[PDB]
Amino acid sequence: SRAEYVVTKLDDLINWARRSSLWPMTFGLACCAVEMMHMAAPRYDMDRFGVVFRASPRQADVMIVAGTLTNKMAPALRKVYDQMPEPRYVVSMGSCANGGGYYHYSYSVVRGCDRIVPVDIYVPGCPPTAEALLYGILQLQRKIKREQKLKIWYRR
Amino acid sequence: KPIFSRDLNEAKRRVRELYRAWYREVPNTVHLMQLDITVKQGRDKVREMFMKNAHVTDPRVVDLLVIKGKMELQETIKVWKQRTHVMRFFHETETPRPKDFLSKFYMGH
Amino acid sequence: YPSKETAHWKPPPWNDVDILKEKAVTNMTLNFGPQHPAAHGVLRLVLELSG
Amino acid sequence: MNLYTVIFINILLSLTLILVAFWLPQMNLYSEKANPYECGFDPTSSARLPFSMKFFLVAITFLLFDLEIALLLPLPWAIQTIKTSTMMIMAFILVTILSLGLAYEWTQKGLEWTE
Amino acid sequence: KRPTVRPRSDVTHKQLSAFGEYVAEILPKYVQQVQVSCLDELEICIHPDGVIPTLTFLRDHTNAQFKSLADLTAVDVPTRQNRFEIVYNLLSLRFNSRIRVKTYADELTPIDSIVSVHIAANWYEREVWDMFGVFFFNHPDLRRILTDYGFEGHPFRKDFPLTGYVELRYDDEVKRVVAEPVELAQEFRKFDLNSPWEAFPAYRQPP
Amino acid sequence: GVVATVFGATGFLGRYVVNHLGRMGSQVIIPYRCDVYDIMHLRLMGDLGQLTFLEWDARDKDSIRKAVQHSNVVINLIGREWETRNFDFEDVFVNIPRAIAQASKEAGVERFIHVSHLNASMKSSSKSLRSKAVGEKEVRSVFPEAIIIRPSDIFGREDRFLNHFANYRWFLAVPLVSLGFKTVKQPVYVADVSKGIVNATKDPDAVGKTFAFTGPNRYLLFHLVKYIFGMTHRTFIPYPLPLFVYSWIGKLFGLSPFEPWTTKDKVERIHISDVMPTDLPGLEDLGVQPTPLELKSIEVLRRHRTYRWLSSEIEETKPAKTVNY
Amino acid sequence: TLDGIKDRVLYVLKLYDKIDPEKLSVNSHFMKDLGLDSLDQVEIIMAMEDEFGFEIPDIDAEKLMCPQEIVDYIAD
C-alpha cells in the first residue's frame, strides 16, 4: 500500500519481539518477591509467556520493583536501572513500591519507587496476588504492543 | 566524667588529629570516587563542617563529635559511602531562601 | 675502594636474609549484593577475598 | 581452498552479526549506564589489581602433562612398527613415569589448592 | 478455674525470688534493685559500672549459666535523668530459665561493651548506638548498622520526628539521588485516643 | 499558581525547563509528538498531578489550542538542527512558533516565552539563524509582549556541542576553519539557561524584553576545542580546512535518513563567531549567576575518555585562554 | 643546610594562599600576626611535611607558630 503501511508492519514486528521476549531482572526487595517467586512457580509459570529471569542488569528488560525501597537502597536501585540497556520498562509491584505502603510515614523509606525511576506499570496489593502480577505483565505487554516508534520516525 | 579527653585541650588535640586525617583523605576520595569537584572544594567542605561545630565547649560533646567524625572518615576511606552519599555535603540541589524580612513576608509567612 | 657512587652501599647481611619492608596485602574487595541472586536482594556483603 | 573459504565465511557471518548488533539498535549513552557493574554499588577498586591464583602449581603441572600428551599422540603411527616390543616398552615406561610424577605430586600435596 | 484469665503458678515465682536474692547478695557492689513481675520474670537493675562483672558472673557461675544473650535493647524514657535504659535478656539452657538485667545511660555517659562476655552483642550494641546514640567502650567495630550511610540523627529517640528531616528523590539536573527536606502531600495524623478515665486502679501514682 | 505549557519539553533544554518548573511547584503541561517511551525521563520530574502529558501535532491547530487552553505561561522551545523531510528550518522556526503564539494570544495566556539564538540575525550566513530572526519578528508581531531569549551555545550532558566536538576523535584529526582562530565562542550552561527561563516565567520586569543568555567567558574556537580534547585526554591534531570543503563534508554527513552527525548549517553555526552583549540584559538581570565551563565540563566530558584517563581530576587540565574582544 | 631549609619553608608559606605574601615574614606569628587559625596552622604543618618528606607529631607541631620555629624544628 504505502511506505507508511510497511513501516507500521515493521514496528508491529518490533513490538512483537520486545513483548514476546522480556527478561525481568533478578531483583526483589521484600515480601512481594515471594509472590514473584510464586508467579515463577509451576501453577502460573511466567516462562510460558516467554518471561525468564536474568541476574545481570545488562541482560534484562523490565525491572520489577517488588518490595520496600529504603533510603539506604535507593541509589543502588537507580544504578541498576541505569545500567539496564534500553529499551527498559519498570513494573512497581506492591504498595511499598507503588507509594509508601505500610511504611509511608517512615524516616527511612522512599515514598514510591517512581520517585527514583520512571514506572511503567503499577500493581496494587500487599502483596498482589501472583495472578495480579501476571495481569500487570500482560498490561505491560499491551503497552509495548502500542508503541509505533518507527511510524513516529517516518512521520518525523 | 570523661568519655576520653579529660579537658578541652585534649579534646582539641583529638579534633586536630581528625582534621589532619580528613584533609589527607580528601584527594584520594576525589580521585577514587570520580567526583566532579576539586580537592580545594573538598577541603573547603571539610573545614566548613568542622567549623559548623566550633561553638561547642563541653569536652564530652567534643568527644562525641570526634567519634562520629571518625566514623564518617572510616565510611569514606572505605568506599561504603558512595558518590551520591558524598555529594550530599554540598547541597547542590538547594535554592537558598532569603533572610530579608520583606522577602519572607512576600513568600509565605 | 670506596667511590662517590658506592658510598650509599652497605655490607650484605651476615646470613643472606635481608630485613625487607613489610609487604602490603591488597585483598580484593567485592560488593556481593544487594542486587545479587544469592544475596536475597537487600544484603551488601563486602567481601575481602584472596583469589 | 575449501577450508579457507568456509572459515572466512564463518568469520564474515560473525562480523556481520556484530555490525548489525552495533549499528541497528537506537543507542542512548551516559556515564551512569556505561559505568562498570557491581551489584548496584560502585566498585571500590580497579579490576586490574592482582588476583591471587591458588592452583598455580597445578597449572605449571598441566604444562608438563600437556607436553606428555604431545609425546603420547604419535602412538597411532608408532604401533604400525615392526619393533612392537620396543614400542610397547617405551609406551609403558612413559605412561608409568607420568603416573609416578602425578602420584608424587599428589602425595606431597601439590594437587591441593593453596589457602 | 476462670476460663478468660491466665492461669498463674507460684513455684516459678518463688524460685525466681530466691534466685534474685541470691544474685543480689552475691553482687552487692552493683545490684541496685531486684524484682519479679506477675508474669514471673526475674529482673535485676544494676549500676552501669557492673555490666561486665554481672554478665560474666551470670554466664560462668554454675548456679546461673545464662549463656545465651537473647536480646540487648535500649528504652528511651526522656523524663528521668538518665534517658536510656539498657536491657539485656539472657537465657540459661542448663536451668531452662530466663533473666533480665537492666542499667542506665545518658547521651554523654557511655557503657562498657560486653563483646568479651557475649559475642552476640557485637551487633546489638551497634544497633543501640545507631538508633539511640548510646556509646559503648571497647567495642571492636562500633558504627551505624541500620540507618543510611550519611544519616544524621538517632531515630528511635522519642524526640526524633517520625518521618525524620530528610528524604530522597532522583534529580535529573545532577543525575543523582538527592537528599532534601521532607515535604508530605498529607501529614501524619496523630489521633488522640486517650480517655479521661483511669483503667487500672492498681497503678495509680500518688498525687 | 503558575500553569506553564512547555512546547519543546522532550529535548536537551526542555527536560531542564520542566525539572525546574516542577521544583518550583507550578503545574506543567507537556505537549509531545514522540513515542510515549521518550517521555519517561520527564515522567518522574513532578509530584502527583503536577505534570500533564498530552499528544499534539504541529499541523493540527486544535492540538495547540488544547495545549494552551488553561495555561498562564507558554514556553516555546521547539527547534531542530537539521531540515526534516516534512519540517524545514522555516517551518520549525517561524510557522510553528507563530501558530503557537497566535493560539496562546487567542486563549489568553499571560506570558509567552520564545527561545531564539544569540547570533540570530537577518543577514546571518546560517539558514537556521536567518529563519530564527524572522521567527522572532513574527512572534513579536502576533504576541507583542512576548519575551525573547537568545542563548549562546548551550553545553550539558545531552548537548550537541561539547559532545559534538569530543566526537571528532572518531575522525583522527580535527578540521577547523582558519584553524579555529578568528572565531569567538561564549558557551552558556544548560542549567543556567533553564533557570533563566523559569525565573523569567515570573520576573515582573521581564515582560516584553529580549534577553541574551551567555556564559561568563569568551574563547577562541581553537582554544575551546583544545580544552575539550585536554579534558577528554585525547590527541588533539588540529588542521585548517576551507569553509567550502567543510560545508561539502557537512552536506555529505547530512544525507543520513536519521539524525545527521553534522550538517552544512551546523558547521556554519560552529564557525560563525558569537557577538558581544551590547546592552542586552543577560542572566544576571533575571538572577542567574552564570557558571563557567571549567567547573561543569568534567561531568559532560568524562564519558569520552579511555580507562587510562577515566579517573583524572578537573585540575589536571590547563584552562583555556579567554579573549576580551 | 639551614639556609635551604629556610628557603623551602618560605616557599611553602608563600604557596599557601590564606596568608598575605608581602606581610608574610620569617617573624610573623600565624595566630597573632598573619591571622591564621588553628586549622590553618595544621594545614601549614602538613604542607611542611609534604615539602620535607618528614612527619610531625601533633605535640611537637602545635608550637611551630612562626617560620623560624619551623626551620629550627627541621634542623632536628
Ligand SMILES: NC(=O)C1=CN([C@@H]2O[C@H](COP(=O)(O)OP(=O)(O)OC[C@H]3O[C@@H](n4cnc5c(N)ncnc54)[C@H](OP(=O)(O)O)[C@@H]3O)[C@@H](O)[C@H]2O)C=CC1
Ligand atoms: N546549543 C543549543 O542547544 C541551543 C539551543 N537553542 C534553542 O533552544 C531550543 C531547544 O532546542 P534543543 O531542545 O536544545 O535541541 P532539540 O533539538 O532537542 O529541541 C527539539 C525540540 O523541538 C521539538 N520539535 C522538533 N521538530 C518538531 C516538530 N516538527 N513538531 C513538533 N515538535 C518538534 C522536539 O520534539 P521531539 O524531539 O520529541 O520531536 C524537541 O522537543 C531550540 O530552539 C534551539 O535552537 C538556542 C541556542 C543554542
Ligand code: SF4
Ligand atoms: S507491598 Fe505489602 S506485601 Fe509487598 S513488600 Fe510491601 S508490605 Fe510486603
